[PDB]
Amino acid sequence: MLIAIEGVDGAGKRTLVEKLSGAFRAAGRSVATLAFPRYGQSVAADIAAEALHGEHGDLASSVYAMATLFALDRAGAVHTIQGLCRGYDVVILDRYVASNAAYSAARLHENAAGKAAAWVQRIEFARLGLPKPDWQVLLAVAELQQRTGAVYAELAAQGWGGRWLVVGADVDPGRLAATLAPP
Ligand SMILES: CCCc1cc2[nH]c(=O)ccc2c(C)n1
C-alpha cells in the first residue's frame, strides 16, 4: 500500500505524515516513510536545490532541467521503494511525482492540462518506471505557492496518476487512515 502525501504546506504535510503513521501503527500495521526530494542523500536533489538558489551557472534558467534532476533522484529510489513495499504494510511518501508536475507547471505558468505535467507523467511513470501510488492525498489550503495549489487541485480532480483524496488541515488522521486502508 503506497500513499503519497502532496501539497503546498511542508510543515502541514510532515505533521500529517507522522500522525497517519501513528494511526496505522495503532491498527497494528508496519509503516515506513520516505520524503522527496532526498536532500542530503541524493546529489541530484541537492544540485537542483542549490541551482534554484543561484548556483551551477544557468541551470535554474530551465524548469525542465530541475524537474529532471528531481525525477532522477526518485529514479534512484525505485528499488528502495519496492523493498519498503515488500518489507512493510504501508509506505507513506512525503511528496512524490505529482509534486514535480504541480511545481513545474506553476513555475511555467501552465495548468494541469499543459505540456509540463504531461511530460512529468511520461518521464517518471512510463520511462523511469516509478511505482504508481495507491492513493495520492492532497492536503489543501506565495503567488507561486498559490499557483501550485491550483495545479495540485486540478491534478486531484483529474485523477492524475491514480486515485486522489483531498483533505483539509482539520482532517482527523485515524479517520483518513480508515478511508485509505479500510480493515
Ligand atoms: C524547482 C523547479 C520546480 C520544482 C520541482 C519540484 N519537484 C519535486 O519533486 C519537489 C519539489 C519541487 C519544487 C519545489 N520545485
Side-chain angles (χ1 to χ4, degrees), residues 1-114 116-142 144-183:
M1 167 92 355
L2 192 62
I3 301 167
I5 310 287
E6 302 283 1
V8 115
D9 187 30
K13 296 181 285 85
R14 264 160 234 142
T15 286
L16 179 59
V17 166
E18 191 175 335
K19 286 180 165 153
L20 214 34
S21 302
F24 289 121
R25 287 170 179 143
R29 309 269 260 170
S30 70
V31 183
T33 67
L34 198 53
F36 288 106
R38 294 178 301 159
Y39 301 122
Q41 308 164 69
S42 161
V43 62
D46 289 339
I47 284 164
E50 297 157 17
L52 186 54
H53 291 88
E55 303 292 307
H56 311 301
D58 63 1
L59 196 158
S61 100
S62 166
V63 168
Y64 281 76
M66 323 211 59
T68 296
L69 290 179
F70 293 132
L72 293 170
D73 168 29
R74 277 188 287 274
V78 162
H79 64 137
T80 303
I81 291 174
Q82 290 165 352
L84 288 180
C85 285
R86 292 196 296 278
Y88 297 85
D89 302 328
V90 192
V91 184
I92 307 175
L93 304 173
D94 184 351
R95 295 196 296 197
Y96 197 43
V97 176
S99 234
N100 211 18
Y103 278 97
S104 291
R107 291 244 175 204
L108 293 161
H109 288 88
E110 295 181 0
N111 53 49
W119 172 82
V120 167
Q121 214 191 81
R122 289 192 288 283
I123 255 249
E124 307 216 33
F125 284 133
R127 189 162 192 181
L128 301 175
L130 276 128
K132 290 234 162 113
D134 294 287
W135 288 101
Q136 288 173 95
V137 180
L138 176 60
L139 177 64
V141 175
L144 178 64
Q145 200 98 309
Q146 276 190 153
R147 230 151 51 243
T148 308
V151 175
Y152 262 138
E154 271 171 305
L155 295 173
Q158 277 293 281
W160 188 93
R163 194 175 27 169
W164 282 82
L165 201 70
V166 186
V167 308
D170 44 309
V171 73
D172 298 317
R175 205 123 141 54
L176 176 62
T179 301
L180 296 175

